[PDB]
Design a protein around this ligand. Structure first.
Ligand SMILES: Cc1ccc(C#Cc2ccc(C(=O)NC[C@H]3C[C@@H](NC(=O)[C@@H]4C[C@H](F)CN4)CN3C(=O)C(C)C)cc2)cc1
Ligand SMILES: [Zn+2]
Length: 296
């Protein structure tokens, strides 16, 4: 009845564009051995450069989560890391032909469909969990990010934009479906920012195909929103991706108050350093565990 590690049953290939780069990228997810973790490969480079998707390799947090090793980056990892967190994937190689993970439709939805179509493989090794034992809070200005002990996994988030088109949601993932209620929540941008962002080489691949485009009053996307609270649900999607840089699924609660990649990563570093606040645990019997995973 032991909760076991999971990899992919089959290879997944996808094609898309970097939100930021506007570059066409070829993506391949490969099964990986027990205790590998999630490892990105820049296969376009000779030799190939691999970066474990871990907090210590986070270099940039400016309008995406960026893994860095010397002069080499992988931009915008948080949506795919979100899908792999959501579906309980411990071990995978992520091959990219370019520096940015493809944006797809702007959500984790295409990533979860492609993975679940390929299926997952249970492996003969206990799944390791990070359990929160003490409260860990970081703040900078009016922003705030907290880990709280919780016998399960749950994410609360609040944003506070002053904009007509608005901002609080809480999700317990032993009670709520990641696939149905979170994975389809798209990234969003404001018309005002897109002009400025175009300048400082950003949003080069952005469109209504991969983002909720907002002017001063309205969503411009013809078909509108997938959820009434899509904006704050996408912040939760991002936080789940960032949390996974821990390298093991969490047993605790996350609370974001206007937090983002920068302050999320501040929290990860503080938590990792305060070893009184967390422990690695396994579950030899799934039936008594606080969390549970869909059939593989
Ligand atoms: C013709 C055309 C149409 C559309 C576009 C575009 C675009 C676009 C521009 C900027 C952004 C953008 O960074 N939004 C950030 C938003 C959403 C959310 N972050 C994420 O989703 C992260 C970062 C990446 F988005 C992926 N995970 C939080 N967030 C903000 O706080 C901004 C308001 C500053 C997102 C999309 C360009 C041209
Ligand atoms: Zn996002």
């Amino acid at each position: 009845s032991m909760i076991k590690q999971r990899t992919l049953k089959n290879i997944i290939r996808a094609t898309g564009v970097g939100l930021h780069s506007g570059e066409k990228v070829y993506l391949t997810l490969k099964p990986a051995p027990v205790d590998t973790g999630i490892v990105f490969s820049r296969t376009d480079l000779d030799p190939v450069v691999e970066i474990p998707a871990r907090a210590e390799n986070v270099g940039e947090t400016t309008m995406s989560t960026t893994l860095v090793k010397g002069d080499v980056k992988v931009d915008t990892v948080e949506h795919l890391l979100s899908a792999m967190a959501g579906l309980g994937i411990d071990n995978a190689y992520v091959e990219l032909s370019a520096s940015e993970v493809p944006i797809m439709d702007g959500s984790a939805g295409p990533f979860v469909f492609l993975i679940q179509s390929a299926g997952l493989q249970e492996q003969e090794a206990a799944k390791k969990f990070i359990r929160i034992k003490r409260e860990v809070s970081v703040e900078e200005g009016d922003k705030r990010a907290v880990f709280v002990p919780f016998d399960g996994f749950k994410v609360s988030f609040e944003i506070d934009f002053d904009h007509p088109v608005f901002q609080q949601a809480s999700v317990d993932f032993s009670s709520t479906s990641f696939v149905k209620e979170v994975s389809r929540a798209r990234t969003f941008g404001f018309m005002r920012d897109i002009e400025y962002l175009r300048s400082q080489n950003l949003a080069l691949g952005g469109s209504v195909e991969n983002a909720i485009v907002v002017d001063e009053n309205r969503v411009l996307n013809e078909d509108g929103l997938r959820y009434e609270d899509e904006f704050v649900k996408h912040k939760i999607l991002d936080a789940i991706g960032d949390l996974y840089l821990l390298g093991n699924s969490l047993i605790g609660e996350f609370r974001g108050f206007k937090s983002g990649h920068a302050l999320n990563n501040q929290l990860l570093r503080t938590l990792i350093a305060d070893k009184d606040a967390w422990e690695v645990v396994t579950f030899e019997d799934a039936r008594t565990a606080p969390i549970s995973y869909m059939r593989p």
